[PDB]
Design a protein around this ligand. Structure first.
Ligand SMILES: Nc1ncnc2c1ncn2[C@@H]1O[C@H](CSCC[C@H](N)C(=O)O)[C@@H](O)[C@H]1O
Length: 282
């Protein structure tokens, strides 16, 4: 359906290498039930000038927001994970994650179904200069996860997420796992994705807003935790990621301990070489 061939494919889905703002267009319209991601944030993003990173970043991301509006079903949701950030050499917060919010409702026309908040106890990006050293700010440990929806009535059922009705606050930490992806990464002498989220994050939203066989898309795949979860929960998925290293290593997530190291490198390099692996069988 897309203008390319997936890096790899499994039982319920397939991951592509490429720019998601292009690939999204290949989806029919009102076809996606849940788009779940956490955008790449480093000093702005693709947009010339350098006017106020806050604004440049916002415009960049709003582009994806626009196309995602079209492709989401009327009962569809667009959950977005954002991490706080200070500005260069000053202990004043950037409010880029909040600017996205306002312009998404005002300009794009989304609705904030509900604002969620993720507390990750163990978080290293905590800026030592302001916290540990100067002792002027506290551990930056809460991420603004915005659950957006195409209409005021997106598909949702909190009983599949029952704790006892749970709250607005999700307390999860990145590693409550060991897994073969970390091991297989170590094998290739490569580093695991620099910034990936715990499986429980997308699990919560996959279970709550979608039913089995629903299409869960992730426009900034990374290590593909989403597709992984969407797989073991029996939803259909599709992920887009720009970097081949990330896609290649992510494939490991869909294998077992019982695989020759010689076969792992083959899978890694073949994907890194542009081949289309059908992981469903060898
Ligand atoms: N325009 C683009 N299209 C597709 N992927 C993109 C992109 N711009 C940035 N990316 C990818 O966006 C990812 C953001 S981090 C993704 C982490 C993911 N949730 C997981 O747990 O790993 C980064 O890997 C970045 O390389």
């Amino acid at each position: 359906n897309f203008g390319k061939k997936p890096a790899y494919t499994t039982s319920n889905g397939s991951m592509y290498i490429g720019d998601s703002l292009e690939l999204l267009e290949s989806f029919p319209e009102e076809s996606i039930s849940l788009v779940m991601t956490s955008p790449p944030f480093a000093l702005q993003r693709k947009k010339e000038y350098g006017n106020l990173e806050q604004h440049e970043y916002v415009d960049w991301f709003l582009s994806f927001a626009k196309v995602v509006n079209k492709k989401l079903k009327p009962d569809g949701s667009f959950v977005v994970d954002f991490g706080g950030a200070y500005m260069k050499g000053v202990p004043a917060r950037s409010i880029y994650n909040f600017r996205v919010l306002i312009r998404m409702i005002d300009e794009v026309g989304f609705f904030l179904a509900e604002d969620f908040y993720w507390f990750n106890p163990s978080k290293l990006p905590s800026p030592i200069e302001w916290v540990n050293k100067r002792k002027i700010r506290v551990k930056d440990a809460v991420n603004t996860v915005w659950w957006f929806s195409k209409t005021e009535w997106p598909k949702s059922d909190i009983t599949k997420v029952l704790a006892s009705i749970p709250p607005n606050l999700l307390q999860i930490s990145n590693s409550e796992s060991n897994g073969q992806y970390l091991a297989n990464c170590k094998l290739m002498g490569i580093k695991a994705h620099p910034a990936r989220f715990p499986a429980k994050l997308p699990e919560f939203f996959i279970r709550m807003l979608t039913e089995p066989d629903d299409l869960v898309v992730d426009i900034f795949g990374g290590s593909n935790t989403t597709g992984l979860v969407a797989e073991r929960e029996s939803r259909k998925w599709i992920s887009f990621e720009m970097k081949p290293e990330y896609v290649a290593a992510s494939a490991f997530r869909f294998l077992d301990n019982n695989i020759s190291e010689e076969k792992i490198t083959d899978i890694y390099n073949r994907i890194l070489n542009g081949e289309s692996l059908d992981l469903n069988s060898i």
